Design a protein around this ligand. Structure first.
Ligand SMILES: *CCn1nnc2c1-c1ccccc1-c1nnn(CC*)c1-c1ccccc1-2
Lengths: 12, 83
């Protein structure tokens, strides 16, 4: 994935 | 609801626009995300891996890298930096 897609999982 | 960053974490967050002394965890993750992106600390090929050696973030988290997929461990690392 992209960094942001991984980060969004974390943020959610 | 709310958490209080210690001084060095608070400096990191304020460096990417944060205005407060206390935050929700989601706001903490939000500013931390801005930070990682602005400094391009993630691996261009394996974008879940953050390299934080030789950065303030690595001093705070006490690791030279970590995986974004390790959500609980990231909370552990942040909580070391909460009052
Ligand atoms: C690809 C990264 N992304 N995806 N969704 C959000 C973000 C994001 C982008 C740029 C900086 C920070 C974030 C971010 N970090 N944490 N969150 C919430 C846990 C976000 C975010 C917040 C609100 C909307 C979208 C994102």
């Amino acid at each position: 994935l992209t960094f942001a897609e991984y980060w969004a999982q974390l943020a959610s | 609801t709310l958490v209080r960053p210690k001084p060095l974490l608070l400096k990191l967050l304020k460096s990417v626009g944060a205005q407060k002394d206390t935050y929700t965890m989601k706001e903490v993750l939000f500013y931390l995300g801005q930070y990682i992106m602005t400094k391009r600390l993630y691996d261009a090929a394996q974008q879940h891996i953050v390299y934080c050696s030789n950065d303030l973030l690595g001093d705070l988290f006490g690791v030279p890298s970590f995986s974004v997929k390790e959500h609980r461990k990231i909370y552990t690392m942040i909580y070391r930096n909460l009052v």
